[PDB]
Amino acid sequence: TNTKGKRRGTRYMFSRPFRKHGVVPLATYMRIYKKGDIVDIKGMGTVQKGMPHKCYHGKTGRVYNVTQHAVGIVVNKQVKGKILAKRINVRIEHIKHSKSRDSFLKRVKENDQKKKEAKEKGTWVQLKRQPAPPREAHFVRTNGKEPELLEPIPYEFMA
């Protein structure tokens, strides 16, 4: 049986990666968070105040609070079955804007735009995504070569 301590097994998570040991680049606490915005937690050694903890190092959740230097944030955590949507109070330093949503938004802005246009036509445009179809009949061509002959090559023992 092991020790429950909040920061076991974090030896090599919270550890800052390389050659970044030092002053936290300021940008990372001068971008604005606001409720609804989805955020990825990512624990950090340097600052220890307002740390998350390992069982959500590397999760995402939406923001529900904004305090002076922290962001209350709702994340789902699995626990012998019942998943619990649960709320923590993590200091900004350990948080980013997940670009997860940001494929959609750019896909929305395009679909509303492509629907408002081609309405003055009335032509039906393919709005939905669609998985990678089977690659279509094409031809190939060699021009003035036959293709190159492979032979499997004889084994000799290298060492």
């Binding site: 529900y64 609070n65 789902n76 079955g81 019942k82 998943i83 709320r87």
Partner: peptide, 26 residues
């Protein structure tokens, strides 16, 4: 077996309403 159990009935991703509580806020 376990995986079997806390999974048989499902693992319900918590049913999230619109209009959630403002308790917790500053």
């Amino acid at each position: 077996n376990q995986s079997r159990k806390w999974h048989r009935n499902g693992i319900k991703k918590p049913r999230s309403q619109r209009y959630e509580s403002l308790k917790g806020v500053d």
